[model samples]
Target: NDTVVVGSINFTEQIIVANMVAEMIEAHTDLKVVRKLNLGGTNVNFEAIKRGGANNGIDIYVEYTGTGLVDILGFPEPNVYITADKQKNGIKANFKIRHNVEDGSVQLADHYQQNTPIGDGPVLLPDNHYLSTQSVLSKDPNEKRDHMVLLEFVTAAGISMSKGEELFTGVVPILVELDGDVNGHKFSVRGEGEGDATNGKLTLKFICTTGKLPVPWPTLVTTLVQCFSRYPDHMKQHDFFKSAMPEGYVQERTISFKDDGTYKTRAEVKFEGDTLVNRIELKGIDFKEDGNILGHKLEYNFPPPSTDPEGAYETVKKEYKRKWNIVWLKPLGFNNTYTLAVKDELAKQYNLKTFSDLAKISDKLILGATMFFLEKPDGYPGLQKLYNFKFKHTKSMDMGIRYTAIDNNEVQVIDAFATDGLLVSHKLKILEDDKHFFPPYYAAPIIRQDVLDKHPELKDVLNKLANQISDEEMQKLNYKVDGEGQDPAKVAKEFLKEKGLIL
Candidate 1:
């Protein structure tokens, strides 16, 4: 009651809460904040605390109530399910969880513009292209047409962000948001589509992975998500989240991706102290082809978040989790440089030009990329920049797949971080593998269960803060990453100092 010490995981949000707690303690009373404590991840920390390993890297930290409910605590499933019928399905069927918008669209079926992000339903865009093809002839509105390269970018981050976390819905909002950083930093479709009699209306559309939020009732989203919260965490950590729920909250399965570290286990773990932190990987898959990955088992556990902020790792005996990585790709031709060139060509062909660009396009950080291109000088040097330069293939680019042989007569073969826009045309095979981690931010602190047993009050207060706080405000505390001209680690230090969690 008179004095206290606290610390959070090593992340922007953790630092934010740590600072707030520290400031509150000093300003309200005479408690000294001793925040220099260990903070890492569930990867090694959870088991460290559970097995009472003694040597650990974390103390108590926040865990969303929902995450604990479904993941650690194993709360019962909520009353939610994706409705199968849709407007695109060209058939109507009403059920407890049937699609609301039912009508006539093909690729997207009954999927709407608002259901994909919340894990509600499939991502589907209206066939506006075919419509525009036969629209009022001669409308030349230079629409800033944006070719959607990946429809499931948000789903990629959905795992570590909430998978197995209680009441966790594997849905992210930023993927389909209309106005915000998720919209590619103002790179949205800027112009209206002109009606073309021959083809159809030149409308850029959203497919399955569209929509901003999830339906609250069927969803009843996690308590950690403030109704008005904006995610710098999603951007900084997970990288794709908007605002709103997906339709039925169904997950669209994807392909296996690899991490730079090349991790490939579904439940990789490392033990530290009394905790065991878990890790998983991410792989790429186009919803059109790999719906089965959605069925892959999502593992997890949720223990009550300890409030000790000093030794909170005792809630769950087993803090379970991990994503999947994939096999390394093999080049069809043995030329290492050629493989690299194909990678470059794939990067360019699909407009995946920069890290920032790929960040928004595929899995966050794009662990691995593959390309399939035809070897030959493409585009004249003079006409390159004007139309993004594509003249003709010197040779027919054949398909190159790492694990399998995909034949394409017109294109060359390149592997690694390339796009399969040709997939819509059935021209190439592109595979992805991603090894995902919790950005060193979402690690739940290993609370001294001993301390919490003595001070139950602290546990409650810590939980309150752990599940609260917006992503934007949290980032500000971690100004190093979200700050202007500030070192992120310094921000971490200050965040702890301000929270009375550190001295």
Candidate 2:
């Protein structure tokens, strides 16, 4: 097939871009062009490209770099996780999990990774004493089974005698092999386990007699417990040894063993080629009290590409190429920065000039927002955490009704984009982001590398839009369609023709 497919999400700007791309390709290329315009939303377009083959894949589409980095790349949320006991002292931790290029496994980011320190301090694990449990599992099922587990406990005082006795004395690794079916997959495990404890560390190694078994590590661990359950007395005495694997690729296991049951251990397990590793652990934190720590007030919010636009652009470009085989073309000139916009009258009445000012009186004001803004991590939730404020009431409504709601005094505040035309029309007072909380959203065209390889002309055709539309121009364009009742396609065509991009 000599056809090139161009797609867009269900937005006015997206539709305009879709038309422009389709028009450009048809005017220049000697190949057939198909326009899958107005295809649902962000996920829809991305999925279309992913599942797209000869039948239903999108060849090219415009996407925002911020969206590509945060939404598509599975960027970490900005909320800090705090672990505090009844003593009121706690460790505040933030974590990001990303694909490691050295090895093709998703792991916790170490100190040197990019997008570091969403907060004031370094984003590394603190030096405070905590317990940790680590494990390793192979990604492949057919490879020889080699699993290792390491458990380390450090206390303010060195390992105590009673604690040592409870952990090491009379504690032995037990092995059981069983054959069964899991989630409709035939599975089996035949393994031997050995355990050693020394100097506040316990190590366990398991080597399977059967070379290849189609079983996940957690499933194998649970089946081992099922086999060991045959010995009722042993199972009763070692209740902590019982293993139950949760239903997911990422496994989270929490164990509590203190006499008072206040101290807790939490571990996150993931597979790395033949080793299931517990990559994250939070110990001595009381799950009942500290489990809800992510919602606590934190100084840091996830910074957007606006902080370092070119650097962020290059980072996402590389990730797109490596992870999804896509190429992100040049950025369009406008940047979308989200901020809190309050009613002009209310702002004057309360002297609310910046986000910091609004934070003090946020509880008295009602917020009108789109459902997307209300739910997205970088939106209201992250804003609240960063600024330490909560609105009196939040009403999630359509973007169309947001301006109307604020204008009618239905809500005192709303989330507004730095480039939104409605901001001008409604005369809302834009609040300054004193903490620089929001990320910069720069728009660009992203296309599958295979599509570009097939029609190399597209690279040049789409790049023609580089630095094309300014923030003012985009707002005016948006105003034409949303406020003046002009069709998006017509607006897009006029802009293209004005730029001498078309005949």
Candidate 3:
């Protein structure tokens, strides 16, 4: 028992996750355990792990499939997972979420309780529920095309009243519009034309738009293919920014630069590499919403005001560079370079740290969209795009398109998509495969070799493990506990031992 020592650098999340492992070992077998931590940052903790001061590093640990793939090993591009449906899934999207969440360990544990395959997949929710389920919608609805502008400005924005208000000032009578129908039933709808209000709701139809193809169809599709293919080329980049969304995430970058934008209230800082700067000065928010030339006050959801992703990106890039100047090593060689034309909005949230060291462990890949922007490495800036999708008219599917504005009506990234949520649902069957398909932010309970390295018995025999406990099982266990809800400690112990994983 005089063999092992471990550390956690003292913190609640660290303490708990480490404790779950340490105690479980204590419970099932005889072992000596010690923890030394509370140390801060990678520098201090990694030093402890290397100097033989601690076992298991005592620094920090995160689990992710994409990270394992290219970052640690520097694998080539085409980072995808195509499961023999002849339906090619882009490799970059092949990466599932990181297991940084301690709760998933618990779910894996509980999933082992029944030792079943996780059902036939995606349960249907009622109509209006898609909004509650997916934060974004299907990325490529028509085979693989996204229409984010429509989803954001129309569907998700909930701006009908504003549109209604503009109706008969009648001065110019053109109102901002978004697209959606809760549960296949219309919410507050705007007029399509004069007296259109008394008539009914009119959703933004894509046939009218893509039919107009802003960019050449062949050219656009070709660009996507190239980017999608080049994904696996950058091992480090892939490891960094895998699906970082901002509900309330803000990181400061201190690189000093010329102020191109103005500030309001607290100066908002943003990043490109690691520099932070201020927000754009507000101009008289003006732009064309529904073909109306409204000046001054603009549509509700954009720029220098709310959801200014591009401006935010530019600011963050500034800040990130500042921080990097202090911490990052100046590159002596350009062994690894990056390419992508992400706008300030998408760029701001792109956490490259994840890509710097990617190691993919799962085979299932997921991509949802309101409308993903197209960016090229040459700094062309992201041209606005949309998702032109089709769906089965059922309760499980909710479709919408919403958009907003920033800094006097400059456009921002629109958010849209459908969700297979509580009441509404969207269902399409992928040919049965050896793997499982997961929705966004929803973790598919899995056991990895690395995780199995830490806990041996969780390995799958034929690439598939048992998870099918069904709705009854989830309800009996009192909901989707474990992964997102349950206690990792008890769940790990019970499930692991039950599956002979701990032993």
Candidate 4:
């Protein structure tokens, strides 16, 4: 009666993680852990958890945050990062900067911070000018520390221009001052830098911290320092930092929980060089078989699309509770999105940047897709209806041949998956679904409310995978199985061993 049933979708990583969860439970708790892993795909696990009881239903399984949000809850995928600026009072601000390329203007509205109103009305910025957030962290602080946030005025061409040219023509520098409270400590800081109307970048330094910073400062500083240290040789030769610093902003930020009550910071740095600063230090959860805590540490990264990890999880959690009486844990950090890909030459020739762009020239393109995609309503038919476009010709081909067809110029477009190993192998250009058609598939663990209520301890045990795997990492794992023909169980076991999740 105390057995906790674990389940997984029909895939390599899912099966692997499900077994890891089962093993963790068996190793750490007296409650018997039963494996129902590899039952089927998303719907199977969803049904199992929803109907969970003494029958063939499962007590717990893994799910994606986006799937629960969109596929299960029927919410639209959130928009991507638009723009970020500093408010009058120095509060860092983000805006939903949607660019209407057709109109040559950007729609700008203050991005609600945790749904709290920032009171800024909608405005428009011309196509040539765009807003970007520049992070200014305090240099290695000795006593007090201060961090600055700046907004740079840059032209589209400024990013690609030479440092001399950009400094001479592409930039406009503005001086700004800010006063804010960090962790209830009142502080005032001002930015001082030299620049002209032609100079596009400026360096700002501030002095303010009264005590040790609360959370992100230490991690942020360390990360930035490490990034600067590892600056690539090619970029260094070109002095790329001088010209790209303003445009090369932090694209994504995630602050997740560590078991010891501290925090782990993961940031995606977007510069001309494309440096990824990832600090992943995961500790195993240790608990006695009697369900008593021995010692435990947990770490998880929210998937990349999520600007607010906790908020995203809350959205998923509420929907799961309301719809299926299920509880979702931290995300596994990897995500899956349906992709529309075309050969690079075709994209360049048609100027295709998004699904809408494809819709414009779709009549000129031949689509090579799987028979499943061609027949399913949600596949090509629904997509055509939604986008209001039809292809010049459609070729029903197997997944294996679709890539070849595109490669050989027999087709210009094909349906693709975000994490498919073939994407890496073929190096295809994936167009954006700017219409927000597809749901995000960010993997996480979900459990029946009844089961969680009984064995609350299972939460920590199963949550070991929170923010562990990334999309690219998952793709590589899948490739090992599908491309290299390795055993799924062995692959799973090897991953767990590599992560020290299993002995």
On lDDT, the leading prediction is: 2
Cα RMSD for candidate 2? 14.5
Q: Any idea how many clashes model 3 has?
A: 115
| lDDT score, candidate 1, position 148 | 25
**The CA-based lDDT of model 1 is what?**
0.27
lDDT for model 3 comes to 0.22
TM-score of 3: 0.22
Candidate 1 per-residue C-alpha lDDT over 331-387 given as tens digits, one digit per residue, 9 for 90 to 100: 111110111112433555666533233333322211122322322111111112112
Q: Find the candidate with the highest TM-score and give its number.
A: 2
In the range 1-503, model 2's lDDT, one tens digit per residue, is: 58878888877667766777777777677878787854565868887777554768787888877777665664532222222221212132223323222222222221111111112321122221212222233233454454423222211210112221233333335343444332233334444343333332333333444454332233222113111111122112221111211110121223222211121223232223323233222222322222212111111112223246777788789877876688999987887678778878888988989998998885554457888888765567767766877678877878478788888888778887766767767878778888877666788888888888878988998888889888778877877776777887788889989999877
Assess candidate 4 and give its TM-score to the true structure. Answer: 0.47
Which is the better candidate, 1 or 2, if ranked by lDDT?
A: 2
Q: Rate the local accuracy (lDDT) of all candidates.
A: 0.27, 0.53, 0.22, 0.51
Sort every candidate by lDDT, greatest first: 2, 4, 1, 3
- lDDT tens readout by residue for model 3, 1-503: 23334445443333333443454445554545555564663234334433332344432221112212222211211112211111111111121111111111100000000000112222111111000001111223553332322221111110022211222122121122222221122222221111112212122212212222221111111011011011122121221111121111122111110111111111121222211112211121112322111211212111111113233223322322332210111111111111111123332444222211111211111112122222221111111111111211111111332111211122222222111111011111111111111111111122222223453422232112123222223222222232245553454345446645455
Model 2 CA deviation exceeding 4 Å by range: 26-32, 51-53, 76-145, 148-308, 343-354, 360-364, 375-378, 390-392, 395-401, 429-436
